[PDB]
Structure formats: C-alpha cells, structure tokens
Design an enzyme around this catalytic site. Structure first.
Site, PDB file in Angstrom:
ATOM      1  N   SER A 160      54.516  44.917  40.943  1.00 48.67           N
ATOM      2  CA  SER A 160      55.362  43.876  40.450  1.00 48.67           C
ATOM      3  C   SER A 160      54.627  43.168  39.345  1.00 48.67           C
ATOM      4  CB  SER A 160      55.738  42.906  41.551  1.00 48.67           C
ATOM      5  OG  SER A 160      54.600  42.263  42.094  1.00 48.67           O
ATOM      6  N   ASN A 195      50.869  42.751  39.052  1.00 43.97           N
ATOM      7  CA  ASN A 195      50.270  42.607  40.360  1.00 43.97           C
ATOM      8  C   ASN A 195      49.866  43.962  40.880  1.00 43.97           C
ATOM      9  OD1 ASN A 195      50.845  39.843  40.435  1.00 43.97           O
ATOM     10  ND2 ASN A 195      52.936  40.339  40.914  1.00 43.97           N
ATOM     11  N   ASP A 238      61.885  27.555  49.773  1.00 42.56           N
ATOM     12  CA  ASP A 238      62.093  28.663  50.676  1.00 42.56           C
ATOM     13  C   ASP A 238      61.270  28.532  51.935  1.00 42.56           C
ATOM     14  OD1 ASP A 238      59.497  29.525  50.317  1.00 42.56           O
ATOM     15  OD2 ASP A 238      60.047  31.388  49.272  1.00 42.56           O
ATOM     16  N   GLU A 242      48.851  29.059  36.231  1.00 46.25           N
ATOM     17  CA  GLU A 242      49.551  30.325  36.289  1.00 46.25           C
ATOM     18  C   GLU A 242      49.635  30.969  34.924  1.00 46.25           C
ATOM     19  OE1 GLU A 242      50.109  31.986  38.660  1.00 46.25           O
ATOM     20  OE2 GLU A 242      50.573  30.760  40.374  1.00 46.25           O
ATOM     21  N   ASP A 247      54.418  39.292  37.296  1.00 48.42           N
ATOM     22  CA  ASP A 247      54.681  37.875  37.289  1.00 48.42           C
ATOM     23  C   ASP A 247      55.037  37.477  35.870  1.00 48.42           C
ATOM     24  OD1 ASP A 247      53.456  37.828  39.883  1.00 48.42           O
ATOM     25  OD2 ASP A 247      51.633  38.259  38.726  1.00 48.42           O
ATOM     26  N   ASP A 306      50.739  45.425  43.427  1.00 48.57           N
ATOM     27  CA  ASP A 306      51.806  46.199  44.032  1.00 48.57           C
ATOM     28  C   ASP A 306      52.764  46.750  42.994  1.00 48.57           C
ATOM     29  OD1 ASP A 306      53.176  43.970  43.233  1.00 48.57           O
ATOM     30  OD2 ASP A 306      54.266  43.773  45.092  1.00 48.57           O
ATOM     31  N   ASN A 313      57.274  36.222  40.322  1.00 48.77           N
ATOM     32  CA  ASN A 313      57.049  37.640  40.451  1.00 48.77           C
ATOM     33  C   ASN A 313      58.350  38.381  40.638  1.00 48.77           C
ATOM     34  OD1 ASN A 313      57.547  38.568  43.291  1.00 48.77           O
ATOM     35  ND2 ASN A 313      56.255  36.844  43.698  1.00 48.77           N
TER      36      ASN A 313
HETATM   37  C1  LIG Z   1      56.169  32.339  43.044  1.00 50.55           C
HETATM   38  C2  LIG Z   1      55.392  33.517  42.475  1.00 50.55           C
HETATM   39  O1  LIG Z   1      55.938  34.476  42.096  1.00 50.55           O
HETATM   40  N1  LIG Z   1      53.974  33.422  42.478  1.00 50.55           N
HETATM   41  C3  LIG Z   1      53.154  34.482  41.978  1.00 50.55           C
HETATM   42  C4  LIG Z   1      52.566  35.225  43.152  1.00 50.55           C
HETATM   43  O2  LIG Z   1      53.602  35.859  43.784  1.00 50.55           O
HETATM   44  C5  LIG Z   1      51.550  36.223  42.633  1.00 50.55           C
HETATM   45  O3  LIG Z   1      50.872  36.707  43.753  1.00 50.55           O
HETATM   46  C6  LIG Z   1      51.082  38.062  43.958  1.00 50.55           C
HETATM   47  O4  LIG Z   1      52.389  38.297  44.348  1.00 50.55           O
HETATM   48  C7  LIG Z   1      52.584  39.673  44.547  1.00 50.55           C
HETATM   49  C8  LIG Z   1      54.061  39.889  44.849  1.00 50.55           C
HETATM   50  O5  LIG Z   1      54.421  39.149  45.993  1.00 50.55           O
HETATM   51  C9  LIG Z   1      51.779  40.082  45.755  1.00 50.55           C
HETATM   52  O6  LIG Z   1      52.003  41.438  45.973  1.00 50.55           O
HETATM   53  C10 LIG Z   1      50.323  39.889  45.446  1.00 50.55           C
HETATM   54  O7  LIG Z   1      49.513  40.183  46.540  1.00 50.55           O
HETATM   55  C11 LIG Z   1      50.140  38.446  45.078  1.00 50.55           C
HETATM   56  N2  LIG Z   1      48.799  38.329  44.582  1.00 50.55           N
HETATM   57  C12 LIG Z   1      47.896  37.431  45.201  1.00 50.55           C
HETATM   58  C13 LIG Z   1      46.490  37.347  44.652  1.00 50.55           C
HETATM   59  O8  LIG Z   1      48.262  36.789  46.113  1.00 50.55           O
HETATM   60  C14 LIG Z   1      50.559  35.473  41.785  1.00 50.55           C
HETATM   61  C15 LIG Z   1      49.614  36.509  41.194  1.00 50.55           C
HETATM   62  O9  LIG Z   1      48.642  35.821  40.442  1.00 50.55           O
HETATM   63  O10 LIG Z   1      51.197  34.870  40.738  1.00 50.55           O
HETATM   64  C16 LIG Z   1      52.066  33.859  41.109  1.00 50.55           C
HETATM   65  O11 LIG Z   1      51.427  32.847  41.859  1.00 50.55           O
HETATM   66 NA    NA Z   2      49.691  34.179  39.054  1.00 49.60          NA
END
Ligand SMILES: CC(=O)N[C@@H]1[C@@H](O)[C@H](O[C@@H]2O[C@H](CO)[C@@H](O)[C@H](O)[C@H]2NC(C)=O)[C@@H](CO)O[C@@H]1O
Ligand code: NA
Ligand SMILES: [Cl-]
Ligand SMILES: [Cl-]
Ligand SMILES: [Cl-]
Ligand SMILES: [Cl-]
Ligand SMILES: [Cl-]
Ligand code: NA
EC number: 3.2.1.17
Length: 129
Positions: free
Chosen positions: A50, A46, A101, A35, A52, A48, A59
């Site tokens: 948001s 991201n 969760d 990560e 991370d 959207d 995120n």
């Molecule tokens: C627990 C956590 O926060 N994990 C991150 C993921 O949430 C991220 O994935 C991205 O999350 C956003 C917000 O929910 C989604 O909109 C987006 O589609 C999603 N991206 C993907 C490729 O699934 C992730 C991004 O690298 O980073 C953490 O794993």
């Molecule tokens: Na990530």
C-alpha cells in the site's frame, strides 16, 4: 502544495479539525508535519504494497483507492490521488473518518511516535487562527 505550518493550521481549523474527536489542532498539524512535512503531494510506499498519500499520509490499504493495492479497502471512498490535492478537503474529510474509527490519531504512526504526549500546541503557536 507545501503548506506553511500556520497556513495549514488555519486550513485545518477551517475544515473543522480543531478539537475534532478531542484532538486539538496542534495534533493535526504535528501529524501533518511528521507524516508529510506539510507536503500535500507526499507519497510513501508501505511494506505491504500500500501507499500513503498526502499531507496526512493516508494509506491505500484501508482508506483510499489507488488501483494498485489489491485486496484493500477504500473507506474514505476516494481515489488516493484526491489526497494529494493542494486542497486538503479530501484529506481532512478522510482523516475525520479515520480518527473517528475508534483508534483516534494513533492511526498516524508519526503522530503516535512524534506528537502524542508532546506539547502539540507548539505546532499552532504564533498562528493567527
Ligand atoms: C491513517 C494512515 O493511513 N496512517 C498511515 C499508516 O497507515 C502507515 O502505517 C502503515 O500502514 C500500512 C497499511 O495499514 C501498514 O501495513 C504498515 O505496517 C504501517 N506501517 C507502520 C510502520 O506502522 C504510516 C506509514 O508511515 O503512515 C501513516 O501513518
Ligand atoms: Na507515514
Ligand atoms: Cl516546517
Ligand atoms: Cl493544540
Ligand atoms: Cl486497489
Ligand atoms: Cl484547503
Ligand atoms: Cl481518541
Ligand atoms: Na485501497
């Protein structure tokens, strides 16, 4: 802070992640590696809008408040900047909520894609824990 692998393993162990929700410590270290490359200051935006944050790339859509993810939740009840601390407590405590969760570590995309189903114990190999 950029953690060393075993340093982070030890910190995560001290913070109760080893076998937390059944996820051995290597899972968490693997997740952090992929990560954030163990960098507590890592941020990534991201699609959207948001972001991370931190060593586990938690995120702002769901887990923390960064003031710029409208309509998002803050389920860890923290400013996202807290997840960038060299002190991983906030990240760990939030990660504990996340992994609890129902979706386990699948919340961590990098974990799913790069750690899940691999020999994650390798990530804590050689570490004094
Ligand atoms: C627990 C956590 O926060 N994990 C991150 C993921 O949430 C991220 O994935 C991205 O999350 C956003 C917000 O929910 C989604 O909109 C987006 O589609 C999603 N991206 C993907 C490729 O699934 C992730 C991004 O690298 O980073 C953490 O794993
Ligand atoms: Na990530
Ligand atoms: Cl490394
Ligand atoms: Cl392990
Ligand atoms: Cl927001
Ligand atoms: Cl810490
Ligand atoms: Cl699970
Ligand atoms: Na948020």
């Amino acid at each position: 802070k950029v953690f060393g692998r075993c340093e982070l393993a030890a910190a995560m162990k001290r913070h109760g992640l080893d076998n937390y929700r059944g996820y051995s410590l290597g899972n968490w270290v693997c997740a952090a590696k992929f990560e954030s490359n163990f960098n507590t200051q890592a941020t990534n935006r991201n699609t959207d809008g948001s972001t991370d944050y931190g060593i586990l790339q938690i995120n702002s859509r769901w887990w923390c408040n960064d003031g710029r993810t409208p309509g998002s939740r803050n389920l860890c009840n923290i400013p996202c900047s807290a997840l960038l601390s060299s002190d991983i407590t906030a990240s760990v405590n939030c990660a504990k909520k996340i992994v609890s969760d129902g979706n386990g570590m699948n919340a961590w995309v990098a974990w799913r894609n790069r750690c899940k189903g691999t020999d994650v114990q390798a990530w804590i190999r050689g570490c004094r824990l």
